[PDB]
Structures are given as C-alpha cells and as structure tokens.
Design a binder for this molecule. Sequence first.
Ligand SMILES: Nc1ncnc2c1ncn2[C@@H]1O[C@H](CSCC[C@H](N)C(=O)O)[C@@H](O)[C@H]1O
Length: 387
Amino acid sequence: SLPVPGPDALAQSEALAASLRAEIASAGGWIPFSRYMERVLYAPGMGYYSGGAQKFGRRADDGSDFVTAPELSPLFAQTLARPVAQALDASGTRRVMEFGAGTGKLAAGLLTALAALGVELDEYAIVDLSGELRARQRETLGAQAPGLAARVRWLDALPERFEGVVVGNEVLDAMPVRLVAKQARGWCERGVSIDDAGAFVFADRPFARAEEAARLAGIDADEGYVTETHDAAVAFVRTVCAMLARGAAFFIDYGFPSHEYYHRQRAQGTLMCHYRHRAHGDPFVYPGLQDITAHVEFSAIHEAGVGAGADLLGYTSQARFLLNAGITDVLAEIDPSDAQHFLPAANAVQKLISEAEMGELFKVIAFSRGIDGALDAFARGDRSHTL
Ligand SMILES: Nc1ncnc2c1ncn2[C@@H]1O[C@H](CSCC[C@H](N)C(=O)O)[C@@H](O)[C@H]1O
C-alpha cells in the first residue's frame, strides 16, 4: 500500500537502520521508543527532520509526506497574525520567535500580515534543530515577504531571555514519546528490540522505578491498553516558558486534555506515521523517510508551562481560535467574483475550521507573561477549565 522509495533514498534509510541495529546491540538489545524516535527523526544528518523541505506540501504528487496549515493556505497565517499582534501590543513587545519553521510560509505570512496590521517587528527569529531548511526558508521569504525578510534571524542557540511572541505549529506532536502498556499486573514500558531476522520489533520491559507506574494509575485501562508519555514535549514547553520574560507563546497542534487523551476507549493510543500522505501505524517502516507523531496531551502541556512560571493565556479548538481571531473577515477580504482566489480560500477555511477536518481535532494553547487581560482569539468557547 505504501509507495516504494527510490533506490537512493532506500540506501540512506538502510545506512540509518544498520547503524541503529548496531546501537541497540551495543545497548544490550533494547531501547525506549523515545530513543528510537530521537534517532530515526532527529539523528544529525540522517534523521527524517535533518533534511530539506520536500516533505512539506499539499499532495502526494508534489513529493510531500503531509500537509500542515501553513502549506494549505495563506489565510492561516493571516488569521494568526491578529492574536499575535494583540499579544505583542498587550505585552509591549516587538519580536516573534517561531520553532520548527518548515518551508518558511508561516513566517512570510505572519510578517506580511503583521505589516498590514501596522506592526513592525525588531526581529523574527527562526529556531530549528539544524540548518537544512534555511535555504528554502530564505527562498520563501524572498518570494512572499521580500521587503520584510531582512528582519529574520536563524538562531543557533536560544537566548537566556526573550521578550515577544513564540509560535509553534505542529511542533509538539513531533517530539519523541515513550510507549507504555497495561499488563495484567500494572504497567510496563514498550520499547524497541531487533528480532532473529534483523527487523525492528516492539518489546516490553519493566519500569526502573515505581513513580513510573503510579502516574498511569488514573487511566481506566484494560489489559493490552497502549499509549504515550510526553516528557520531551513537557521539557520543551518548560524551556520556552522559562525563556519567555514578557509576551506570549502559542502552540497549535492536534490532541486532547488528559481525560480525553487517556480515555478508556483510546486503547491503541494515538501514535501515527505519515509517508507520502498515507497515515499508518508502523514506525519501523522506511526509517528516516517518514514521520512518526503522537497527539498532544494538553493537560501536561498546561502544567509544564505554568510550572515554569508562565500564565495560561487560553486553550480552545482551532475552529474557535481562528473564528474568534477573524478568519471569516479574512476570507471576506477576497472578492467572491474573483473565483480563482475565492474558491480555494473558502475551501481551506472549511478545512481549517470544520469538525470533520482540522477544526475540532486541532487545538491552540497559549501561555503568557506580563499580559493582564484576555485575547480576543480566546473570547468565546475557551476550554481552559477542562484541562
Ligand atoms: N525542540 C525543537 N526545536 C525546534 N524545532 C523542533 C523541535 N522539535 C521538533 N522540531 C521541528 O518541528 C518541525 C515539525 S513539522 C511542522 C513544520 C511547520 N511548522 C509547518 O506547520 O508546516 C520539524 O521541522 C522538527 O524538526
């Protein structure tokens, strides 16, 4: 069912795989799933995300693996600019920092939409783990925001403090997770080993310490339940919120609060892989050539940000956030008689806000420091009390 990679791509994946087999052997034959993801997704040079921009796009026939809101439509960035601007104003700051900037479309769109709102930034900082997307980002910015691109900086390291607005779209979902599985007796960790034939397989091990099972005790799990823990995303949000001195941080991503994430019925968890616009469950397929994600558990994200000293600014579905922020007014700026522009825009809005598409599954959580009031983008249907 999955497309076969070309022979040159298979050679890269094979080299990654062979090194990882050797690593698992040297480790004693078992590694946590988080280390497996760390390698296949983020190995320097060889990881899926240590690579260029082809993976981002709209359709299989452009060579991409998955679509994201910035790739889908400029109306996403144009809408997001409204709460970003309000947060800059409320906090008295003048910089934006984006993590995981992809092709640069979100940055170019935010810059041009912020300018149209009368907001000039001192800096738009792009934070990626390595530098392989810098050339495509520069190209996008030159093509789509030519008179504003000069304000962009690609950081090699985070500042100790930051005053401004942080953005990350589909960044939290991409972070390594550990897998846990319910036994007859308590819970264990599901990791990765290598079978007799040299294939990657799941394999279970006990936890080293009892705190580890006790944090899962509240899950109403039957034997066989398997789900994900999200320490990496928690650590990242703490880093962001400890760095933030004044301003806000917005994370847009698919997921749920804890009571929904770890619901009795969600017994297979949320782990999914994306390859050439096919979603499937096998993270051992073509290592380095496909993504592996889990949904975001927003209660733990909330606790992470607030625990590092930030305030919760809001939490709601992407539909409510974008509607509150003015996406319907953004669409109304386009003349309905201009069919070439209007129909694709209306279609993308539908995808961004419909519960059958992105609108309910995707959520937006925000943190702040030095913001006393509420953002308009959270003024209706905020779900903070459910976290
Ligand atoms: N700790 C971290 N800091 C910066 N980027 C990270 C990160 N962890 C993961 N990422 C990056 O986040 C990206 C997720 S893919 C989504 C890309 C883009 N925001 C879009 O919507 O189109 C990847 O490029 C991955 O390398």
